[PDB]
Amino acid sequence: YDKWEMERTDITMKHKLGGGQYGEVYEGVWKKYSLTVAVKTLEVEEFLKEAAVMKEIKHPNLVQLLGVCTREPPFYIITEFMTYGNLLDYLRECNRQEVNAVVLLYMATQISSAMEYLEKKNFIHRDLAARNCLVGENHLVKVADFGLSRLMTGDTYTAHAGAKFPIKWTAPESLAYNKFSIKSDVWAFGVLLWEIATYGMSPYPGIDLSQVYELLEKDYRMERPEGCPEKVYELMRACWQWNPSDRPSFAEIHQAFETMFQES
Amino acid sequence: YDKWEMERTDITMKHKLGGGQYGEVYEGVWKKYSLTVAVKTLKEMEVEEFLKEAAVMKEIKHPNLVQLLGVCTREPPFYIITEFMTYGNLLDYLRECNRQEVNAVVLLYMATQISSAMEYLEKKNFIHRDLAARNCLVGENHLVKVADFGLSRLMTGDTYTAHAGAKFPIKWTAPESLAYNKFSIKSDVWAFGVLLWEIATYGMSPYPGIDLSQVYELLEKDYRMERPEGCPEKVYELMRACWQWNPSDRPSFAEIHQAFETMFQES
Ligand SMILES: COc1ccc(OS(=O)(=O)F)cc1-c1c[nH]c2ncc(-c3cncc(C(=O)N(C)C)c3)cc12
Ligand SMILES: COc1ccc(OS(=O)(=O)F)cc1-c1c[nH]c2ncc(-c3cncc(C(=O)N(C)C)c3)cc12
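A: This is the predicted complex of the input protein with 8DW.
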């Protein structure tokens, strides 16, 4: 924890990144290494808890923590900077000849690797979506990891009373009972697969949010996107099983995508 | 897992190979067979891409492509184990050889072997994308094999578009690749032409003294490297054919290999 502490003065703050969609997150420069970094600034105990979790996280496809300023306010969380920004904008703007089917498989394989790691370490993500995935050089993809929750005892994590979720990415049991688990992360992953497959289209386009839960209850599911391989869509549908115990594990998901990626 | 998986303990590592120019590649011993092998390991290339390269190598079977022997992919550190080519890379080999031994007939033999490998990749819908003397390896009696880590699956005749910001070895790179990041078996043919030039000059650097930033401009105006000293006109014609501006005007590797086999046999 102390090894993570840095002086705030080591960093030159720049502009807020991502058009402000992530709140107080700024592009910054670590002067010593001339290294571009991402800096989130400051809710205190939650903030410190999240920094503490990020200290324990070590995976090639999870955003890597570089430093922390938790001695005095303003508080800082310093992480690596992903040059190509968030996956949603990236998909929307890319050359699809370059970012073709094999690359889409590659992205899914990387993300599922990160989630398999979290699954094993008894963490849950709770905000898996393309907007929260980042892209680096050579189609490298990493998942943003501020907000991970640790499962202290059971498989299920209960969100704070009155918490609001992104409805279109949120599993039915999470919508209904504010219960989250690695299986609700698997549901969100299914939606993320749909985002990838459509090069960043909005899920359930044109559908009333008030109807989403009931539609899901009565077995409505997004149709296979144009050009999406049938095996990928099968995985998508598996992720969207109504009963969480019927959804595949991230280990299974990652194995399947790894196989498809390697055969491509 | 499959027949390819082996225990890490089957292998004893020695020193890093090739002066480190190929990264984390080591000479090693497969203890069971007292066999010297080459081992590529992963310290920190993305993992999934590494594993995919191993997967592709499992499918490769040709006398002039480096043969995969085994793989360690259960747990880190990951290994790709292949046969070891005693004389190292073709570039240094050509530079350091006794040219009375590595004479004209041997140069033809080398081109024939390499073109055989590329004809095989062409048939099997793979592209190499980094053909050059530095990526060919030499064994006893002038045996040559093409290094095949990095192969990509691509239906022969289709185009692969490289990632934005990718940096290429400019002097080996086809004009459509330089300009538009487009690669195909035909860009491999272009690079093969440059490799032929490397062979004919015994490992000279191509486009000597020419500013890299101008190479593309020159190629546009139909500048091409001159015939190397001692290079037979037929071989130079093949070279020039490999460097046609339009990829579809370049010969196939089947055609190239047939031409070299004929020349080697007529020697
Ligand atoms: C979703 O990305 C993040 C969300 C929260 C966050 O706070 S944390 O430090 O406590 F984790 C950090 C990030 C984040 C870590 N590294 C990052 N690298 C790049 C970006 C980013 C996302 N979207 C757009 C931009 C951008 O404006 N450019 C690339 C120009 C940049 C965003 C991040
Ligand atoms: C281009 O050579 C390789 C590159 C990558 C690689 O990884 S892997 O996934 O395909 F295994 C393996 C090789 C490789 C396979 N067999 C080989 N045999 C010899 C050499 C080599 C190249 N250059 C110099 C040396 C050397 O230092 N000596 C022979 C002393 C040895 C290099 C190799």
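The longest strand of chain A covers residues 35-41. Residues 101-120 of chain A form the longest helix (20 residues).
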